[PDB]
A and B are shown apart, each in its own frame.
Chain A
Amino acid sequence: LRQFIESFIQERLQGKLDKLQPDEDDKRQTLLATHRREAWLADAARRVGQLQLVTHTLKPIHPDARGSNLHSLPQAPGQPGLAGSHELGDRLVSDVVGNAAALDVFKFLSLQYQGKNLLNWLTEDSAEALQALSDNAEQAREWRQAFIGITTVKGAPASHSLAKQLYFPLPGSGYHLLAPLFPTSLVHHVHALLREARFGDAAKAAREARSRQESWPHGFSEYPNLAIQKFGGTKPQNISQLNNERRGENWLLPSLPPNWQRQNVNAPMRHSSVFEHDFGRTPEVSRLTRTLQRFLAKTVHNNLAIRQRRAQLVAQICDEALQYAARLRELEPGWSATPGCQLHDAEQLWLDPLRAQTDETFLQRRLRGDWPAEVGNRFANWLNRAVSSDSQILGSPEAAQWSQELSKELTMFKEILEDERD
């Protein structure tokens, strides 16, 4: 293992003593090799207290805030609906924060786990070469007084003004001000997931079969709306270790409400469109109806989950029309009947502008409103048209159950529809 130590140093010979300068080789050819037997292992003995290994770093919050980079791991929370870096356990890539001109010391102390375990035993296996390591004999006692010290943290509880210190209120008590850190290992575990789950060996395999349509059982992922957050800017390796796949980026997961990048310039209704009457024929509704058509209503082989998922699906459409109603109601005060009316009866009565007034000359209906249900029945006549084709459902009571699904959702729909005019 001494030879395995020194072959690493033979690489450190060959990595550094490679381009001999013809002017200053007198130290570079001669002195640079002489320390590399034992004194280089004593050169790094004074070079332990200049680097630290951290699970959590502070510098991504602001790249100059001097803080306390830490290494501890969370406990189990207790409610298993949560998720943090306590789920990792063994796969911990603790990115060392420190000077770039000394990180080979951490590459040197990586030689504990390489092959043999030897992690917690920097206190034994001292003198000899093969089964021990021959970090040499008399100096195998004051080196371990130093080289263990990179594993522990520098002991100072400190923060900075640029470190996002947050109050948190207590049950019937004062405040703990919480300083959240940046979980580097939890981020780097997701880069190990997302680079694999997008494009790898098996990920490209199922993608190539899309043209082939030859389904061996293996799913492939797809992650829309990822966000790139960069750190360090023009200088990424001056902060925590940003690797060759995490090159100063964080893939961020989207957390967005469904009314994102919607139709901001709201297109009006009452035109020659044959669909846009009572349900909002939009690409967010057309993708929803085909789910009910192509399965879960036509392909029925169960009463537990099949009958269940038909119930909330029309409860979506009962409220999606209400979403469609209020967007058409809001930000359109100048709605009227005169542009393009051929079959749009009572659409002036239901999705009206309230105007804080009535506008009527040869008519009384505009002053008030009672039972706007015929457009809801036409919506209910659309819900019978919403399912495409199913001929084997009429003899079964499934369409009779679906008629009850049609009936129990209009009953909610009519009562909601009252107070816009009642």
Chain B
Amino acid sequence: MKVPAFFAANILTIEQIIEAINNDGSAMTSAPEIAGYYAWDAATDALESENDLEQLTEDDFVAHLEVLEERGAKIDRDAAIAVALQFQAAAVNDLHS
């Protein structure tokens, strides 16, 4: 469906995520879609039986997104949530054929 570009690179850490959105993201990507895909990836992992991707709302996208704000990482709220809904909407078209 949808793939990132700053991810699937060399192996990252939390400190290397924060320094990206402190810049304008990175080369070939953007600071919205880094914190947005991170907020979607942190939300989609916490599920119990992973048959409840439809249960992922906008609220738990925010709760993982605020973890970066606790340690630097000045982000954009309206941009990253909209990117996190793109990967969530992409993660249901594959569920229905």
Interface of A toward B, CB cutoff 8 Å: 63-64, 66, 99-101, 233-238, 244, 247-248
Contact = CB atoms under 8 A, between A and B. Distances in A.
B42 interface: yes
B12 A101 contact: no
B13 A234 contact: yes
Nearest to B77: A19
B94 interface: no
A238 B64 contact: yes
A101 B63 contact: yes
A248 B14 contact: yes
Contact of A234 (B17, B48, B62): B17
A235 B46 CA distance: 11
A101 B14 contact: no
A235 B42 contact: yes
Contact of A99 (B12, B46, B67, B70): B46
Contacts of B12: 234
A233 B46 contact: no
B59 A234 contact: no
16 contacts: A64-B45, A66-B48, A66-B49, A99-B63, A100-B46, A100-B64, A101-B62, A233-B13, A235-B14, A235-B45, A237-B42, A237-B67, A238-B45, A238-B46, A238-B64, A247-B71
Nearest to B46: A238
A234 B13 CA distance: 5
A237 B64 contact: yes
Most buried by A among B14, B41, B48: B14
Contacts of A233: 13-14
A345 B67 CA distance: 71
The 6 closest A-B pairs by CB, nearest first: A101-B63, A101-B60, A100-B63, A101-B59, A237-B67, A235-B42
Most buried by B among A66, A235, A236, A244: A235
Instruction: State the majority secondary structure of interface residues on B.
Output: helix
A247 B62 CA distance: 20
A100 B48 contact: no
Given A64-B45, A66-B48, A100-B67, A236 B14 contact: yes
Contacts of A237: 42, 64, 67
Contacts of B59: 101
Contacts of A99: 46, 60, 63
A27 to B, nearest CB: 13
A100 B17 contact: no
A247 B71 CA distance: 10
Nearest to B13: A234
A37 to B, nearest CB: 21
B84 to A, nearest CB: 13
A101 B56 CA distance: 11
Contacts of B41: 235
A99 B59 CA distance: 11
Interface string B1-17: 00000000000111001
B80 to A, nearest CB: 15
B28 to A, nearest CB: 19
A296 B41 CA distance: 63
Nearest to B58: A101
Given A99-B46, A237-B42, A244-B70, 5 more contacts: A99-B60, A100-B60, A237-B64, A238-B42, A247-B71
Interface in B1-38: 12-14, 17
A64 B48 CA distance: 9
Contacts of A235: 14, 41-42, 45
Contacts of B60: 99-101
B53 to A, nearest CB: 15
B36 to A, nearest CB: 15
A233 B60 CA distance: 20
A170 to B, nearest CB: 35
A99 B64 CA distance: 10
A234 to B, nearest CB: 6
A234 B64 contact: no
Interface in B71-87: 71
Nearest to A66: B48
A248 B70 CA distance: 14
Nearest to A233: B13
A21 B42 CA distance: 26
A67 to B, nearest CB: 11
Contacts of B46: 99-100, 238
Contacts of B42: 235, 237-238
A63 B41 CA distance: 14
B87 to A, nearest CB: 16
Nearest to B65: A100
A101 to B, nearest CB: 4
Nearest to B60: A101
